[PDB]
Amino acid sequence: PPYTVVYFPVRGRSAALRMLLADQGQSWKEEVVTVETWQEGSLKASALYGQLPKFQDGDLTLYQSNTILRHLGRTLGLYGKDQQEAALVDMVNDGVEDLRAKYISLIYTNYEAGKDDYVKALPGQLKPFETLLSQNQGGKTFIVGDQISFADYNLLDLLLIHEVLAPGSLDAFPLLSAYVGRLSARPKLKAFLASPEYVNLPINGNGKQ
């Protein structure tokens, strides 16, 4: 630390890292980049893949949302208790990333045309996270082990946004409904999710949710 998130006035691929910081009792600066600022071409030109988020941690500069997440898991001890759990944390997040890339591509690339095909495939896509949960202490704690990981935040954000896209898509998944239900209640995380820092922001950058 200190932490700075440099991003568009959208939740997008920073919603989960932001949650993590907040749940962890941490504080950060929000650097905001409007499309106008981005349209200047100054930020993009330095950015390693011409894309945001950008994260500064003390004197360390990072791109890629999952790098940032992994770096915070590695520093705040949110990467499982051991080398097995490390691997299972990854498996979970890689799975989140896969569904998220699908979600993004629907939203930005063809929303109204694909929504039906997307939401149809959704139960099949959520079932492995129910399974995962049911194979660890009975879905009673976290997605991996019995302490919180970066994969938990990234997955929490995945389900929240999906409840907006497809109201009631978690009915069929009891363990997962209680898990969003429980993890939201975590005191600092309740507060963060109610902050205008979050609430004032739309999920996506194109009107679509």
Q: Which is nearer to a copy of itself, 126 or 193 (by Cβ)? A: 126
Total residues binding a copy of itself (CB under 8 A): 27
Among the listed residues 39, 42, 98, 108, the single contact to a copy of itself using CB under 8 A: 98
Of the listed pieces 18-26, 92-100, 147-155, 187-195, which binds a copy of itself according to CB under 8 A?
92-100
Closest approach, Cβ 178 to a copy of itself, in A, equals: 21
Tokens describing residue 181: 């239900």
> DSSP class of residue 138?
T
CA distance 17 to 24: 10
Cα of 24 vs its chain's centroid, Å: 15
> Which of 42, 84, 109, 206 is the binder for a copy of itself (CB under 8 A)?
84
Residue ranges in contact with ligand GTX by CB under 6 A: 8, 10, 12-13, 35, 38, 44, 50-53, 64-66, 94, 98, 205
Take residue 19 and report the two structure tokens written for it.
């949650």
- Strands 3-7 and 60-63 turn out to be unpaired
* 157 within 8 A of 10, measured Cβ to Cβ: no
Contact present, 133 and 143 (Cβ < 8 Å) = yes
Chain residues that interact with a copy of itself, rule: CB under 8 A: 48-50, 60, 62-64, 66-67, 70-71, 74-75, 83-84, 86-87, 90-91, 94-95, 98, 101, 124, 128, 131-132
